[PDB]
Scaffold this active site. Structure first.
Site, PDB file in Angstrom:
ATOM      1  N   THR A  61       0.792  -1.221   0.000  1.00 27.30           N
ATOM      2  CA  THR A  61       0.000   0.000   0.000  1.00 27.30           C
ATOM      3  C   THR A  61       0.830   1.279   0.000  1.00 27.30           C
ATOM      4  O   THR A  61       0.249   2.366   0.088  1.00 27.30           O
ATOM      5  CB  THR A  61      -0.941   0.020   1.214  1.00 27.30           C
ATOM      6  N   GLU A 101      14.770 -23.991  23.031  1.00 28.49           N
ATOM      7  CA  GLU A 101      15.792 -24.989  22.741  1.00 28.49           C
ATOM      8  C   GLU A 101      16.109 -25.028  21.249  1.00 28.49           C
ATOM      9  O   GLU A 101      17.272 -25.191  20.862  1.00 28.49           O
ATOM     10  CB  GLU A 101      15.331 -26.357  23.245  1.00 28.49           C
TER      11      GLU A 101
HETATM   12  N1  LIG Z   1      -0.116 -10.590   5.754  1.00 29.86           N
HETATM   13  C1  LIG Z   1      -0.709  -9.427   6.004  1.00 29.86           C
HETATM   14  N2  LIG Z   1      -0.119  -8.241   5.618  1.00 29.86           N
HETATM   15  C2  LIG Z   1      -0.735  -7.063   5.877  1.00 29.86           C
HETATM   16  C3  LIG Z   1      -1.960  -7.029   6.530  1.00 29.86           C
HETATM   17  N3  LIG Z   1      -2.335  -5.736   6.655  1.00 29.86           N
HETATM   18  C4  LIG Z   1      -1.379  -4.955   6.098  1.00 29.86           C
HETATM   19  N4  LIG Z   1      -0.389  -5.765   5.604  1.00 29.86           N
HETATM   20  C5  LIG Z   1       0.854  -5.335   4.942  1.00 29.86           C
HETATM   21  O1  LIG Z   1       1.474  -4.352   5.755  1.00 29.86           O
HETATM   22  C6  LIG Z   1       2.042  -3.329   4.957  1.00 29.86           C
HETATM   23  C7  LIG Z   1       1.404  -1.990   5.309  1.00 29.86           C
HETATM   24  O2  LIG Z   1       1.519  -1.769   6.696  1.00 29.86           O
HETATM   25  P1  LIG Z   1       0.248  -1.660   7.675  1.00 29.86           P
HETATM   26  O3  LIG Z   1       0.353  -2.640   8.824  1.00 29.86           O
HETATM   27  O4  LIG Z   1      -1.057  -1.832   6.941  1.00 29.86           O
HETATM   28  O5  LIG Z   1       0.361  -0.139   8.196  1.00 29.86           O
HETATM   29  P2  LIG Z   1       0.440   0.300   9.741  1.00 29.86           P
HETATM   30  O6  LIG Z   1       1.317  -0.641  10.533  1.00 29.86           O
HETATM   31  O7  LIG Z   1      -0.940   0.385  10.336  1.00 29.86           O
HETATM   32  O8  LIG Z   1       1.159   1.735   9.640  1.00 29.86           O
HETATM   33  P3  LIG Z   1       0.334   3.064   9.243  1.00 29.86           P
HETATM   34  O9  LIG Z   1      -1.026   2.704   8.698  1.00 29.86           O
HETATM   35  O10 LIG Z   1       1.124   3.856   8.233  1.00 29.86           O
HETATM   36  O11 LIG Z   1       0.169   3.892  10.493  1.00 29.86           O
HETATM   37  C8  LIG Z   1       1.781  -3.708   3.512  1.00 29.86           C
HETATM   38  O12 LIG Z   1       2.914  -4.360   2.979  1.00 29.86           O
HETATM   39  C9  LIG Z   1       0.613  -4.665   3.595  1.00 29.86           C
HETATM   40  O13 LIG Z   1       0.607  -5.565   2.510  1.00 29.86           O
HETATM   41  C10 LIG Z   1      -2.558  -8.218   6.921  1.00 29.86           C
HETATM   42  O14 LIG Z   1      -3.645  -8.210   7.502  1.00 29.86           O
HETATM   43  N5  LIG Z   1      -1.924  -9.411   6.652  1.00 29.86           N
HETATM   44 MG   LIG Z   2      16.959 -31.526  28.390  1.00 27.09          MG
END
Ligand SMILES: Nc1nc2c(ncn2[C@@H]2O[C@H](COP(=O)(O)OP(=O)(O)OP(=O)(O)O)[C@@H](O)[C@H]2O)c(=O)[nH]1
Ligand SMILES: [Mg+2]
Ligand SMILES: Nc1nc2c(ncn2[C@@H]2O[C@H](COP(=O)(O)OP(=O)(O)O)[C@@H](O)[C@H]2O)c(=O)[nH]1
Ligand SMILES: [Ca+2]
Ligand SMILES: [Ca+2]
Ligand SMILES: [Mg+2]
Lengths: 440, 423
Positions: free
Chosen positions: A179, A254
């Site tokens: 995103t 371990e």
């Molecule tokens: N596997 C997986 N990846 C996710 C998911 N949600 C977001 N991502 C990935 O996380 C990245 C974006 O970060 P996010 O966690 O959505 O953003 P955030 O941590 O909330 O940070 P901000 O929104 O900028 O404050 C992208 O690479 C997405 O593809 C999820 O539910 N599962």
């Molecule tokens: Mg042992």
């Protein structure tokens, strides 16, 4: 004792946390209201599942978890979702403004306004522990909160809890579901800042999970729900040794002894099998040998890389379900005589095996078939450095032109932090090269 | 007279428990500590290992030690778990993470004093304590690290008493972690200095025996402990029943240890069991000396016997025993050093072990034991030349110099054995 506190940071961390704790409740027989009829000790206990669940006097089993996000809409779904009665309100922490995919805002501008409250709530959980073992931190590399606030939290946790162990489940970015253009930046910044504060980190390549859902489960366009339910199974396999017990059970710490030969070389590659749909699993029983062989098929890896072109520094097999050592040992013998498993010359070549007899569980309405036996392999291979190389290359392409850097400088960061972080990554890639060279 | 037993760590407590199960049966002691035997030979020397509580109940003079409660909880609820003195359970909660440094310097140091309090209370109740007996492994953290720490503390407080250990040596064939060579090398240096007698129990030999001889497709730790229990009962027979030879720990050391550092014994047992055809005295003698019956994976023909103690159990012909022991000596006299005349001593005990009418136990001080320390030294060096896995130890305050010194002293031990193998 041996309590484990989980911390879910950002959207990715929170949503993966939802899938994990749902799966945990099903594995242990805990209802959405926290009740667990099989637990005959009310208000407490020293059972294996108490490493992850505390108990109230009213019989509620409460996750030892904190959910933190700088905006509220994701955790709000938890507040109103099916397991809303599972968590005390104070475990779900939200701000009003997110980090806008900017490491600088998650670590500084926005993160600094909530960090003290988060540490306070973590402390409340730690005080309930009689023998805290460590933390599990779930976060993405690409998000501004998952990258910037996680690094801040990790730095603060080293201060408040010393060298108490901190493990990561890190979501490595993939173009199919990414995103933000600057996710390579955020990835390098957080990896550098957290490196010295993390004892062990399991990277989850979203593209690897994406391909697995498409190839193995025939999901045309996998969603986060598809990805997270698969990730849950891997996380479950890894933590199963902490939440269950058995004669052949081997504790995760371990395996850790074998997986981390040097502090910086602490990124295991996970491979999980079997990932199969209910249609294909019908009348097709997958033996120990078949799921073990699948662990050495790179298409089943959690990170895209080629271990056949690197060297092994450790191989761990975490079985669960109907598995006995006899069939394991026979399967391992077949694999060594037909696979390219080259170890570095300074490591023993034996595989370390653990078996949890509790069989795997699937969530209702999921895509995974319910199987009688599963396995997660944790290997320390030089090939995982491929993931760093791909990310570092995208970093170099943009940073050479200082593309988007003004968004970070505007929030208080300096170019020196970018170059400092990139140089640390270059040294890390170099470290993985050196450990693979033969001894003189 | 009295021996104080100590068992430390997972391995040490699991083999120690089985040891008390076996000799309790031989002495007619039931899980409640009550005697129900048919012979006075069972009670004549029972005070060597048992204290007599009120009501004519016998309590092992045993101290159970561990840095985590798991393994000791199972012992307490085991078959003979109720016989042990509850106060003699001394355990922490953190564990040692298969880390010699945690057992020896940090986690173990926090617990060692309470263990010594129990040792002192047992010793003070001894009319004439003769020494200590420690069961432990060298590949882990608690038995290896805290076990050797206890030995050092015990020697400081009882420097004129004999220290005896049953030390399980690690093997890649039966391995838990890759750092076992580190923990073992660090422990051997301690044992070389602070023990008088060490029975080298090699998990490599135990596995090979279960797999090749006993035809056990996939041996478990339980199967390994069966062999250990039988060996431990055999080598302590002379301490537990009336006899003339090696009847106490000091006399055993005088007969077995010609040089202070060369006190690492190669035990053997016959017949090897996991059968209704009782053996013959000639068959016991051949198997007892057969390398396939040795509990340390070393070929006796690659070295020479400095001293040997043989124990025969059961109703048999002493005349035939002496003839066969003289037979094997006179036929393979090249494997016994000529500068120690009559270095093979034989004892006989009428009471056989459970399930057998005749058995034989071997205790050899052979220079071939250097192959065992050579194996550990190679595995140690393979990792140490790259300083691999050392952060687990430096994180507990250890410096690399301590590893270099442990390596050096074990290489010295190897060369000292080779010195007398060519004499
Ligand atoms: N596997 C997986 N990846 C996710 C998911 N949600 C977001 N991502 C990935 O996380 C990245 C974006 O970060 P996010 O966690 O959505 O953003 P955030 O941590 O909330 O940070 P901000 O929104 O900028 O404050 C992208 O690479 C997405 O593809 C999820 O539910 N599962
Ligand atoms: Mg042992
Ligand atoms: N024979 C035997 N060896 C064991 C047993 N348990 C562990 N070991 C060995 O001991 C080493 C591990 O040490 P352990 O006693 O488990 O760790 P500790 O509790 O810190 O002393 C490894 O080399 C294992 O092969 C057991 O029950 N029997
Ligand atoms: Ca309970
Ligand atoms: Ca403490
Ligand atoms: Mg967000």
């Amino acid at each position: 004792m041996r309590e484990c506190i989980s911390i879910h940071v950002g959207q990715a961390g929170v949503q993966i946390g939802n899938a994990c704790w749902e799966l945990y409740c099903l594995e242990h027989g805990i209802q959405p209201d926290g009740q667990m009829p099989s637990d005959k000790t009310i208000g407490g206990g020293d059972d294996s599942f108490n490493t992850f669940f505390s108990e109230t006097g009213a019989g509620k089993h409460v996750p030892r978890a904190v959910f933190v996000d700088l905006e509220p809409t994701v955790i709000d779904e938890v507040r109103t979702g099916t397991y809303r009665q599972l968590f005390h309100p104070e475990q779900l922490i939200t701000g009003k403004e997110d980090a806008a995919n900017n490491y600088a805002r998650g670590h500084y501008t926005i993160g600094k306004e909530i960090i003290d409250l988060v540490l306070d709530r973590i402390r409340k959980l730690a005080d309930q522990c009689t023998g805290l073992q460590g933390f599990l931190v779930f976060h993405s590399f690409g998000g501004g909160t998952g990258s910037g606030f996680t690094s801040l939290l990790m730095e603060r946790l080293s201060v408040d809890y010393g060298k108490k162990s901190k493990l990561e489940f890190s979501i490595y970015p993939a173009p199919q579901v990414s995103t933000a253009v600057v996710e390579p930046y955020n990835s390098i910044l957080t990896t550098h800042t957290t490196l010295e504060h993390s004892d062990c980190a399991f990277m989850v390549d979203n593209e690897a999970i994406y391909d697995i859902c498409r190839r193995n489960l025939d999901i045309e366009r996998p969603t986060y729900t598809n990805l997270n339910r698969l990730i849950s199974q891997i996380v479950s396999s890894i933590t199963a040794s902490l939440r269950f017990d058995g004669a052949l059970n081997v504790d995760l710490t371990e395996f850790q002894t074998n997986l981390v030969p040097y502090p910086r070389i602490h990124f295991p590659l996970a491979t999980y099998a079997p990932v199969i749909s209910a249609e294909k699993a019908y009348h097709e029983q997958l033996s120990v040998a078949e799921i073990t062989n699948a662990c050495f098929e790179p298409a089943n890896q959690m990170v895209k890389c080629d271990p056949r072109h690197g060297k092994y520094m450790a191989c761990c097999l975490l079985y669960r379900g109907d598995v006995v050592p006899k069939d394991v040992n026979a399967a391992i013998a077949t694999i060594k005589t037909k696979r390219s498993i080259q170890f570095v010359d300074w490591c023993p070549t034996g595989f370390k095996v653990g078996i949890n007899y509790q069989p795997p569980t699937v969530v209702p309405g999921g895509d995974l078939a319910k199987v009688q036996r599963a396995v997660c392999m944790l290997s320390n291979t030089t090939a995982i450095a491929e993931a760093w190389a791909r990310l570092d290359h995208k970093f170099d392409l943009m940073y050479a032109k200082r593309a988007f850097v003004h968004w970070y400088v505007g929030e208080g960061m300096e170019e020196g932090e970018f170059s400092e972080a990139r140089e640390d990554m270059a040294a890390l890639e170099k470290d993985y090269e050196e450990v693979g060279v033969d001894s003189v | 007279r009295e021996i104080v037993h100590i068992q430390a760590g997972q391995c040490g407590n699991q083999i120690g428990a089985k040891f008390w199960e076996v000799i309790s049966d031989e002495h007619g002691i039931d899980p409640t500590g009550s005697y129900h035997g048919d012979s006075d030979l069972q009670l004549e020397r029972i005070n060597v290992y048992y204290n007599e509580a009120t009501g004519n109940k016998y309590v092992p003079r045993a101290i159970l030690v561990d840095l985590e409660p798991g393994t000791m909880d199972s012992v307490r609820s085991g078959p003979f778990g109720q016989i042990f003195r509850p106060d003699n359970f001394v355990f922490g909660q953190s564990g040692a993470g298969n880390n010699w440094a945690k057992g020896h310097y940090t986690e173990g140091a926090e617990l060692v004093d309470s263990v010594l309090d129990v040792v002192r209370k047992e010793s003070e109740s001894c009319d004439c304590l003769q020494g200590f007996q420690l069961t432990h492994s060298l590949g882990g953290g608690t038995g290896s690290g805290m076990g050797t720490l206890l030995i050092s503390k015990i020697r400081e407080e009882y420097p004129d008493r004999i220290m005896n250990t049953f030390s399980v040596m690690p093997s890649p064939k039966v391995s838990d972690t890759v750092v076992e060579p580190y923990n073992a090398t660090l422990s051997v240096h301690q044992l070389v200095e602070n023990t008088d007698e060490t029975y080298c129990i090699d998990n490599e030999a135990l596995y090979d025996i279960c797999f090749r001889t006993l035809k056990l497709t996939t041996p478990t730790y339980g199967d390994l402990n069966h062999l250990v229990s039988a060996t431990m009962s055999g080598v302590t027979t002379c301490l537990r029943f009336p006899g003339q030879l090696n009847a106490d720990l000091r006399k055993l050391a005088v007969n077995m240890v010609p040089f202070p550092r060369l006190h690492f014994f190669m035990p053997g047992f016959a017949p090897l069991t996991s059968q209704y055809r009782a053996l013959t005295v000639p068959e016991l003698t051949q198997q007892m000396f057969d390398s396939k019956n040795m509990m340390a994976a070393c070929d006796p023909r690659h070295g020479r016997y400095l001293t040997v103690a043989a124990i025969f159990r059961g109703r048999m012909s002493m005349k035939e025993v002496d003839e066969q022991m003289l037979n094997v000596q006179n036929k393979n006299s090249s494997y016994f050093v000529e500068w120690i005349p009559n270095n093979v001593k034989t004892a006989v005990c009428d009471i056989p072990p459970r399930g057998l009418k005749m058995s034989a136990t071997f205790i050899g001080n052979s220079t071939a034991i250097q192959e065992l320390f050579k194996r550990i030294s190679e595995q140690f060096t393979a990792m140490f030349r790259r300083k691999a896995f050392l952060h687990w130890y430096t994180g507990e305050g250890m410096d690399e110099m301590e590893f270099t010194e442990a390596e050096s002293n074990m290489n010295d031990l190897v060369s000292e054995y080779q010195q007398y193998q060519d004499a």
